[PDB]
Ligand binder design. Sequence first.
Ligand code: MG
Ligand code: MG
Ligand code: MG
Ligand code: MG
Ligand code: MG
Ligand code: MG
Ligand code: MG
Ligand code: MG
Ligand code: MG
Ligand code: MG
Ligand code: MG
Ligand code: MG
Ligand code: MG
Ligand code: MG
Ligand code: MG
Ligand code: MG
Ligand code: MG
Ligand code: MG
Ligand code: MG
Lengths: 86, 82, 62, 205, 80, 56, 71
Amino acid sequence: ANIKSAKKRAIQSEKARKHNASRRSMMRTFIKKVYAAIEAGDKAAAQKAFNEMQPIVDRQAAKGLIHKNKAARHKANLTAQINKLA
Amino acid sequence: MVTIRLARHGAKKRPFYQVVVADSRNARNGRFIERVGFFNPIASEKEEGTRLDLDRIAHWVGQGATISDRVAALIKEVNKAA
Amino acid sequence: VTSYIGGEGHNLQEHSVILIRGGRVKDLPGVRYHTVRGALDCSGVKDRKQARSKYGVKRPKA
Amino acid sequence: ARYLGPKLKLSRREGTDLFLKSGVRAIDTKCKIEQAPGQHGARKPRLSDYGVQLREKQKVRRIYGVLERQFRNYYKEAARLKGNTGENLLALLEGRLDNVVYRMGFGATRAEARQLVSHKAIMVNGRVVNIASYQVSPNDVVSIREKAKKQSRVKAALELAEQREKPTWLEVDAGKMEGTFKRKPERSDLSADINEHLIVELYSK
Amino acid sequence: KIRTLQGRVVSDKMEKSIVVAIERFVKHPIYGKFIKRTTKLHVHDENNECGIGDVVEIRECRPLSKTKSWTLVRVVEKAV
Amino acid sequence: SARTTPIARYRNIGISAHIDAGKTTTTERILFYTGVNHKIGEVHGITITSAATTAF
Amino acid sequence: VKAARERFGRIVQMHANKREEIKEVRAGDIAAAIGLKDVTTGDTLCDPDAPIILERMEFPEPVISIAVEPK
RNA sequence: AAAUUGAAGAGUUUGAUCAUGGCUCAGAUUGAACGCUGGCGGCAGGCCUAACACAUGCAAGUCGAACGGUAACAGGAAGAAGCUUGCUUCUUUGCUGACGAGUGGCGGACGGGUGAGUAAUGUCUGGGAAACUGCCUGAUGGAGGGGGAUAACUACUGGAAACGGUAGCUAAUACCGCAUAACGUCGCAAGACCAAAGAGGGGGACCUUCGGGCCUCUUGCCAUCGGAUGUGCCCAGAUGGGAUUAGCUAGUAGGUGGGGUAACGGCUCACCUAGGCGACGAUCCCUAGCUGGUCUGAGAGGAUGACCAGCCACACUGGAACUGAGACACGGUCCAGACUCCUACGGGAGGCAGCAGUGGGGAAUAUUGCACAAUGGGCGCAAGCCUGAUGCAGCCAUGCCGCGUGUAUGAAGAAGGCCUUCGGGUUGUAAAGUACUUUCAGCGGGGAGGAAGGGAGUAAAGUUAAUACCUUUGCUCAUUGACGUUACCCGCAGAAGAAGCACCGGCUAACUCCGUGCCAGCAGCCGCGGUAAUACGGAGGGUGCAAGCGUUAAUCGGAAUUACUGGGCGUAAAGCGCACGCAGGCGGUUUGUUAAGUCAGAUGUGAAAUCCCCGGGCUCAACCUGGGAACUGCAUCUGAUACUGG
Ligand SMILES: [Mg+2]
Ligand SMILES: [Mg+2]
Ligand SMILES: [Mg+2]
Ligand SMILES: [Mg+2]
Ligand SMILES: [Mg+2]
Ligand SMILES: [Mg+2]
Ligand SMILES: [Mg+2]
Ligand SMILES: [Mg+2]
Ligand SMILES: [Mg+2]
Ligand SMILES: [Mg+2]
Ligand SMILES: [Mg+2]
Ligand SMILES: [Mg+2]
Ligand SMILES: [Mg+2]
Ligand SMILES: [Mg+2]
Ligand SMILES: [Mg+2]
Ligand SMILES: [Mg+2]
Ligand SMILES: [Mg+2]
Ligand SMILES: [Mg+2]
Ligand SMILES: [Mg+2]
């Protein structure tokens, strides 16, 4: 980068990348656990995982790491699949 | 940011400004939304050098537009001198 | 291409770097361009003081 | 932008008076009107259909002291203007300032009229102009700066003014040397010896 | 109120979809002769209530597929 | 604007001699002695002569 | 010498460790100009008011002549 | 009133004619080049080639009124007072006027450049639904309580540089929980969950821990629902050439589910069906940014897409994402490829299709200028700072416009030149001389306007506890101009310094003499030159334009010479050797219906500029500009039903 501004933006974007990727990685795991419970056929634990994951996506939506409509899609289709199964 | 701005047309050394509503992210003589009025700082002093439709200006400022410093000087001057 | 050299006499030879212009010569078949006298290597016609601009002749002082 | 050559060769070319001299002496005394310039001017050739139209245009250009660029602009303006282009062009050439300066009596020649207008010697409605192409509108007044009011040349032109015919569309006052442009003259004001449709025939080629 | 186009169905083989041909007369830009121009559209058709040559009423809608943006409103004549 | 150095101070000289009499060596040494003289005054680089140069 | 009109600018001085841009050149000094359209050795560039020619120039006549063809 | 009301031909085939038919010219126009020549000013334009490579300098910063701080210069108190005349004021501390680097916020996705790619993830016109949207707005409400890190810094230390590496320390409007939770999200409902940040100014009673408490003003923060603006998506029509390109497609075409996008969608995946496009030109190949518009044309058309404005696409090339409201980002990151540069050889750096400029290519296209004075943009409470956007300046007759290079008089009419029937005319008022003038250019002086604002205050009103702080409006004061020695005006003297280019056989305005002798040469066409050349070369004379004049290049017109307007096919070019026949084109006549074509009205749109009309300002004009007209093109509603269609 040939400008102080661009240089500073490089390091800031690097920190933002790592920090945001940490939230994304930790977030996807809960959806993956719920999805695994789906063919695991559990009844209490499926809702347990859903109740544990529905708040974590909300912080992400609030800070904008994801979009609120994306979080709505996740929780809506997940609860649809759980209501279908249980 | 919708803003009230002046587009400088006319031959060089004799400006002539078009008072128009536009977007802040556009050039001075670039894409605008709709014309409001004009201004001539080289007016003959015997013919009017500032025409400016206050109706659309009021509509836009109530809509959420921003009036530039030169435009504000014009509103003040027209509302006092007439 | 082949180009025609107008005017009375010329000082042109092998490896001469000229500037040709358009214009077809009817009598010579195959010739469709003229040589601009007074530009680059081509010299002005000598003793031609009518229509000098046609042949790149500076105004003679008189 | 101006002809600096002889002023009687032009008149000899058309075999008619051009009013290019003040008129102190007779034109036929001062030169040979009926003989064209040059050693062949004794012989009268045949003027073609293009010849007569060119001849008339080139004549009018010498009467009114204009060049071809401006004269074509005048033709285009007259053609654009509603009415009859033939007279409209003459109306514009009348509206030429130095022309009305000549007409109202401040110059025995349009050449001297241009000389005077060039040196801020003429003002219109008080405002001084030095452009000879200045278009004069009806109800406008012209005069002289007090510096050039002392000039004897304008005084001498004053006596020739009433010697020649007074234009209708001009009202003058030699007392304080000021004139007024009533309205653009129509066709009949100017001499019928100048044909107008030849011009439009030429420029509608 | 809603817009209205009417055409003739030409292909019904696709499941829950149809192909509608729209014919209109336009004056030729250069010569002036009136020629018929044809546009074919893929129209959503649930329950497969269309055949071949049946005149069809269609309406513009959401993009329901890669090449389907129109839906059946009514069919006016059947079994030609 | 104003002449920083008086015209009388200026010295326009040329080093001339036979081949290998040491003309380049002398010009390089002169440039070095001037550079060191005006660098020591503050403190207690690639150099090429080519055409005419200036020094104090 | 060539009776022609040119303009200066981009004057440069040599300092034995760098070459430095200079805005003006005073009498009794040596300077180099860049972008001169038509100028040769022995040419007097002087103030437009006074066209002066100073001692012209002297060039040694050639002593060795060969013929060069490009190949 | 006014706003498209406008249309020329000529030369050339033949012994001669008519026709057909091609070629050429007379007209406008240019981002022009070159030849000759060249005074001034205004406005505009200025690499059409190599999207060739780039040296050098600038083109994107700001905010201490966010936070830890003080590196550097100016102070404040002290101080051995450094000091002796307290003359000099020689230490100390962010202590602050201010502020480097640092964290953080916002901007860097705007502004600017180019047209390579793209015949369509493009543009123009008209429609839509399934979306998002920083800053600027409007309303409803919250803004409580903590925690863990880390930069800078310290210590050590690697490095030539670029830049670092380990161990501690330090905050925040950085980060993260917790509290709260609705007109928000999910869920048929019950129910579950989601955020925040403070910072500056002043202060009456009280006030200690002198830091505070509290109160007031301004501003910022959080959630929602809006508006505006901007953007994404979809559909229809239109938007080059080629059949010596006829078949093309396999996520292909549709469907069911699952995933994914801000949003709908083979976006994507797994199955299932067997599609889909194409002669109304698919596929393939070549070319190409598109539009408003520009040139031309009577129009219909033709050519075109510089400048100005809208949109698109690109940023050494090929990819890829990250951050971010917004990018797959000209001056940001990673990888690969080609190229170049520095080096201590240990390793590093870069991308002018930004402003200038360089080389190279070319017939050809300019200065490494100034100012942020004005408009505008970014940041900031403001002042301010940045802005190669912009304003201006320089070069270029590159175009348009204007104006000058003198005015009047001046005769056997000088000299000389030219021809001459030796009579003369001729250049020619032309010159010389005589009176007048100074436009412009020079000199010296004066002299607007582009300048609004913003500061020091001064008064008045709101706000509260406040005659504080702040907000709003008048008055005083100093002022703010790069251009710039501005436009413009004034006095000097002198005509003083300012004309050239092309042509003269016909087309086509302009004619003789002398040289040569089918040579030399001219020529757009027809054609001139073989001893008288109005056509070659020179002179004289004349003609046409003019600070320009010619040639060349290119487009249209003339060309009704691709004929839609508006052509032909017996012999001039042109009826397939003939027939059947699909597609297509067209189709007797009446009754009813529909309203597809057609027509009427309305409405919305057809960006602005440009064009055209009437007016205004630059002394006029070019130029700038107010209003109109036009943009007849598209959509949608309502009708009309004679004709064509169903
Ligand atoms: Mg001119
Ligand atoms: Mg030796
Ligand atoms: Mg040596
Ligand atoms: Mg190349
Ligand atoms: Mg291309
Ligand atoms: Mg960038
Ligand atoms: Mg760059
Ligand atoms: Mg450049
Ligand atoms: Mg800077
Ligand atoms: Mg043609
Ligand atoms: Mg035609
Ligand atoms: Mg024919
Ligand atoms: Mg035949
Ligand atoms: Mg037959
Ligand atoms: Mg058939
Ligand atoms: Mg019928
Ligand atoms: Mg209808
Ligand atoms: Mg207008
Ligand atoms: Mg318009």
